[PDB]
């Protein structure tokens, strides 16, 4: 399937969200409740 | 201060025509069968060109019988029981 919604990808914009920050944030929330 | 095979042979007393014959195949010095390339063989003179022989275009690959008779085939006077 060759359409535009499917082919186009958002990789280039990934700096707009802090992936590494949220992972560590939920690490904090992991140790806060003690899993 | 390079190698200079001639002065290397002169230092070793190796007969400088021989020393060079160590580093080319036995086809090019001694009478021995060997792979020859037909372009080396030589060509008769065309109207455009001159003659082509393997005397002028390959002096250093031609056979020397000084070396051949002194190395390979036997002397007769060593065997003469007469």
């Amino acid at each position: 399937t060759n359409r535009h919604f499917f082919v186009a990808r958002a990789n280039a914009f990934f700096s707009r969200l802090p992936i590494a920050r949220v992972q560590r944030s939920l690490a904090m929330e992991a140790v806060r409740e003690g899993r | 201060g390079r190698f200079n095979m001639d002065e290397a042979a002169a230092a070793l007393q190796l007969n400088p025509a021989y020393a060079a014959a160590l580093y080319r195949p036995l086809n090019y010095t001694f009478h021995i069968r060997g792979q020859l390339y037909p372009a080396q063989k030589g060509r008769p003179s065309r109207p455009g060109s001159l003659a082509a022989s393997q005397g002028r275009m390959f002096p250093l690959y031609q056979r020397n019988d000084r070396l051949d008779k002194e190395l390979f085939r036997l002397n007769s006077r060593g065997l003469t029981t007469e």
Partner: protein, 97 residues
């Protein structure tokens, strides 16, 4: 911490302070190579500046820092610098008792 972009947020500080107690034996006189984002090249250029120490990297005037990361070129320098800035005081505290 390690992978943060741009400015270092305060939350990120919390991370470092958490991992302070993660490693039981640490002193402000520890070698540079225990820091986040201190590579080979980043350690070496600090050494020729006569800096072996977490205290010593916490002693930087920030115009030593930038020419460390611009004129010289140890990248991610402000990360390790700031990493010192945070952690040097708690370390002294844990050193006393």
């Amino acid at each position: 911490g390690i992978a943060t972009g741009g400015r270092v947020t305060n939350e990120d500080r919390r991370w470092w302070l958490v991992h302070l107690e993660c490693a039981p034996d640490i002193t402000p006189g520890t070698f540079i190579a225990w820091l986040d984002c201190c590579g080979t090249h980043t350690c070496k250029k600090l050494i020729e500046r006569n800096i072996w120490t977490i205290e010593q990297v916490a002693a930087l005037d920030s115009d030593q820092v930038d020419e460390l990361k611009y004129r010289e070129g140890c990248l991610k320098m402000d990360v390790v610098w700031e990493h010192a800035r945070t952690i040097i005081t708690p370390l002294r505290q844990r050193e006393v008792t």
